[PDB]
Every structure is written in structure tokens, then in C-alpha cells.
Amino acid sequence: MTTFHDLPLEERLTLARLGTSHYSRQLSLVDNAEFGEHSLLEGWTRSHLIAHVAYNAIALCNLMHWANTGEETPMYVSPEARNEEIAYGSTLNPDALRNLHEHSVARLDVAWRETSEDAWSHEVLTAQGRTVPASETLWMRSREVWIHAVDLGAVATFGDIPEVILRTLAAEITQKWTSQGAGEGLVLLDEPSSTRYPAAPGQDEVVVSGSLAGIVRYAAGRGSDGVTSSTGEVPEPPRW
Ligand SMILES: [Zn+2]
């Protein structure tokens, strides 16, 4: 069982496009009057989330420009600028935000469509400091649209997410925790497939198990309803 990264470029582009359409269907379900209400993400109204998804598309466009021109263009000018623009976007009227989402989506797709073969492997830097090939934007965008589709609070679920994306997320999140020395002894178990996703090593093992969608929702900090613990009590997972 392969990861998103092993997939051919065309299939990764399709998954990103599918996730975007999935996210857009959820946004379409939300009413303009509901933008000001809390999203499923603490501290963020739907407007904040909707703005963020658009600014992320724009940030990924920067990496693709960097890739195609060879001229360094970071995802965001600065952490402050990233936060400040999300703050600004969250104040915009609903239709303005729907237009921003639509246009930012369209522009990122064009960026991908016009990317040269060599540019796809050009090294760029993520906002988190990772050195990756430009093609990583296909994965990065997929994480955003498939997961934030759920955060919109309409009808999207982790169960809606293609397994290849869920498997890659389970591995990535636990790999991130491991790199940070987080989640000592904590191991996620995709019970149906008997696949373990360990974090940092510890003396007391705690196995949190469920279906793949269940452990990913859990690892993503979005709930424990789909998992159970080997100790009878599910701990709060390390942040992500
Ligand atoms: Zn995000």
C-alpha cells in the first residue's frame, strides 16, 4: 500500500482537484449567513477557515513560480503576514470570500498545468522549513482541501477521504511527532489492516486503534469518536 508520493504526477493532480471540488461542494452548502459562525476549528469562524484555504492556494502558487522561474518566492512573506491576511480575509463579506476561493483555486490549477517537467522536481521550501520538490504542492494542497472540507462543518467526513491520502496522513503525522520526540509510547493502529503508526519511543505503550479514517481524525486533533485505547482511556494526541 502505496503513499501519495509514489503516485504518478497525474494521479496526484487528480486527487488534489478531486479534494478541491469536494471542499467546494461543502462551501456551497454553507449559507452566507453562516460564515460568521464558529467553524469546527477552535478560534476560527468559517470566514477565517475559508480565507485560509484561499491564502494557502496563493502560497502554493508562489512555490510553483519559484519552481518554474528558479527565483526564490517563499510561501508567505512572514508568519505575521500570514496571520494578518487571514485576519483581514475573515472580515470580508461572504460573496467576496467565495470569489477569492474560486479565483485562488483557478490560479493554482493554471500554475500546475503550465509547470514544466523539470520544474516539478525543483527544490523549494515549505512554510514549516522542509526542503521538498515543487511537486510536494500537490500533496500539500490535498491535505488542506480534504481535511478543511470536514472543518467547514457541513457534511464532509474523514471517511470521504481517499485511502491513499489517509494512509499518507497517518504516516506523516506520526513521522512529524517522532521527529519532535512527541507521543512517547503512543502508537496508532489501523486495526482492519493491522498497520501500526508509532511515534516517539517510550516505556509505556498506549495503542489507539480504529479504522484508518478514525485514527487520522484522532491524530489530526479532530476527535476521538472513531478510536479506543488499549489502556481504556484515549489520551489527547500531540499537537498537529
Ligand atoms: Zn490549513
TrEMBL record:
<keyword id="KW-0862">Zinc</keyword>
<feature type="binding site">
    <location>
        <position position="148"/>
    </location>
    <ligand>
        <name>Zn(2+)</name>
    </ligand>
</feature>
<dbReference type="InterPro" id="IPR034660">
    <property type="entry name" value="DinB/YfiT-like"/>
</dbReference>
<dbReference type="Pfam" id="PF07398">
    <property type="entry name" value="MDMPI_C"/>
</dbReference>
<feature type="binding site">
    <location>
        <position position="52"/>
    </location>
    <ligand>
        <name>Zn(2+)</name>
    </ligand>
</feature>
<dbReference type="InterPro" id="IPR024344">
    <property type="entry name" value="MDMPI_metal-binding"/>
</dbReference>
<dbReference type="GO" id="GO:0046872">
    <property type="term" value="F:metal ion binding"/>
</dbReference>
<dbReference type="InterPro" id="IPR036527">
    <property type="entry name" value="SCP2_sterol-bd_dom_sf"/>
</dbReference>
<keyword id="KW-0479">Metal-binding</keyword>
<feature type="binding site">
    <location>
        <position position="144"/>
    </location>
    <ligand>
        <name>Zn(2+)</name>
    </ligand>
</feature>
<feature type="domain" description="Mycothiol-dependent maleylpyruvate isomerase metal-binding">
    <location>
        <begin position="24"/>
        <end position="152"/>
    </location>
</feature>
<protein>
    <submittedName>
        <fullName>Uncharacterized protein</fullName>
    </submittedName>
</protein>
<dbReference type="InterPro" id="IPR010872">
    <property type="entry name" value="MDMPI_C-term_domain"/>
</dbReference>
<dbReference type="InterPro" id="IPR017517">
    <property type="entry name" value="Maleyloyr_isom"/>
</dbReference>
<feature type="domain" description="MDMPI C-terminal">
    <location>
        <begin position="160"/>
        <end position="239"/>
    </location>
</feature>
<dbReference type="Pfam" id="PF11716">
    <property type="entry name" value="MDMPI_N"/>
</dbReference>
